[PDB]
């Protein structure tokens, strides 16, 4: 027979449409409420092996999405079952993502619009950080925008909660997180007591990506990355980055010794505005404790200069009526 | 919203189990029994009381939707616990929780062949049940407990260590023995725990310099009249519980 279930609707009440994102631990359809036409995104809980009942990392994600209710963070509407069995995460549908826009050449951003995007992106980071959450997966692909031009951070699959590390016991978080290209130096050198700044780095890589239309530092492996970074920010030394020696991989990874900071310069050609440059710079700072934070970044003169942040709705509609996603 | 898992006295009366032949009295004991099973298991599996409480809350809420006649306490508990453990950052391995559950319910029998079909089925059985639990709870697994406020609520009346201890005991037994957690917010239950703890320890909480009673600093909705009714129900069932009261009795 059947079991009572008042608080978990069958996913049948949504009509699948098209596979929109093929990320890791994410099989993302689009869907339509069979009654209201309301569009949603369905993330089916992978259960590849999971020989330990419901996937804990899934429980983690679920706890987090429920806690984050904010305008620049994706929205979990509910959770649905199938009646083996399957579990679906249901979110408010958003029509574009930053990856789909930056690649499509039919799309162009004015300086002011770009300002709004970053303003929205940094504000969202301020929120989650204020809620002691790390996103740990910063990349254009995980940044969505609705029809009405609202930016929303998404995919908290890798996200985890963080604590104030005192009592003489540094944290042991997982080290191999966030995509390679958008990954920060602290993690490559094998840090396990990292914090908010790791997402800020990601945010840096995105800023540039707004003008360059392409992930600025593409690396084959963790070694090719670290070099590629140093070839933009300069050489990793105790002079520029105090106590960077303590890492077991410091030069025990054959790091390139001769490099001077060539960030502003290598970018001037793409981004013209001197303010934008100055920000991208304080975001792509090597030493995490010297890298700019969500709060201060917002207060940067960039967000307060003649070309003031604009709303995006007009562009999105006039631009294309289609949704940009791989 | 935030009232879904809180019920009225009439609602508790007309439970899912009532509608299948179960007397109020019968049912309340099924709960206590499940709680006991949990407490026992959790100790053996070496999880925090916090975890065991979360389990107990899951169990309570669960049987406000499902009936004991369809789901026997003995099968739901291990699943509830298993879930609570993962949820609270103390995961226990599935086999590990089945073993312990077995020995508690059948202290004599020996564990089946971990290769047999019998065993494999009770493994699938628990995973299924944990699923049903998740669904019945609408995947709302973040729980808040009186103990959080009772550490802060005792600090608020500058209580003795003994009076504090005693308070926690009330707190935890309230969870096992009564359905308070299905009726009153954690803050409130904490007050009920402390009030009774005073009455038991012949401790008198001094009225504020204003005239306000200590509980108004915790949950405005709390009236002495209520506290007196709850502490009465709580003490009543405690007295019926063997050896329980003995643990806080002043013997000197």
Residue numbers in the entry:
A (entry chain A): 6 to 88, 96 to 338
B (entry chain B): 8 to 259
Give verbatim excerpts from the published study on this entry.
By soaking DRB into preformed CDK9FL/cyclin T259 crystals, we aimed to exploit this stabilizing effect to observe the CDK9 C-terminal tail residues. The resulting crystal structure, solved at 3.6 Å resolution, shows unambiguous electron density for the inhibitor and 11 additional CDK9 C-terminal residues as compared with the structure of CDK9FL/cyclin T259. CDK9 adopts a closed state upon DRB binding in which the N-terminal lobe is rotated by 8° with respect to the apo or ATP-bound structure. The CDK9 C-terminal sequence makes no direct contacts with DRB. Phe336 inserts into a hydrophobic pocket just before the hinge, and Glu337 inserts into the ATP binding site. The orientation of the CDK9 N- and C-terminal lobes induced by DRB binding is characteristic of protein kinase and protein kinase/substrate complexes that are poised for catalysis. Taken together, our results suggest that the bound state of the C-terminal tail and the associated kinase conformation observed in the CDK9FL/cyclin T259/DRB complex represents a conformation that is adopted during the reaction cycle. We propose that the DRB-bound structure of CDK9/cyclin T reported here represents a short-lived conformational state that is adopted during the phosphorylation cycle. The C terminus transiently folds over the ATP binding site, thereby stabilizing the N- and C-terminal kinase lobes and promoting ATP binding.
CDK9, the kinase of positive transcription elongation factor b (P-TEFb), stimulates transcription elongation by phosphorylating RNA polymerase II and transcription elongation factors. CDK9 adopts a typical protein kinase fold, whereas cyclin T has a canonical cyclin structure. In addition to the protein kinase fold, CDK9 has a C-terminal tail (residues 331–372) with a largely nonconserved sequence. Using kinetic analysis of a human P-TEFb complex consisting of CDK9 and cyclin T, we show that the CDK9 C-terminal tail sequence is important for the catalytic mechanism and imposes an ordered binding of substrates and release of products.
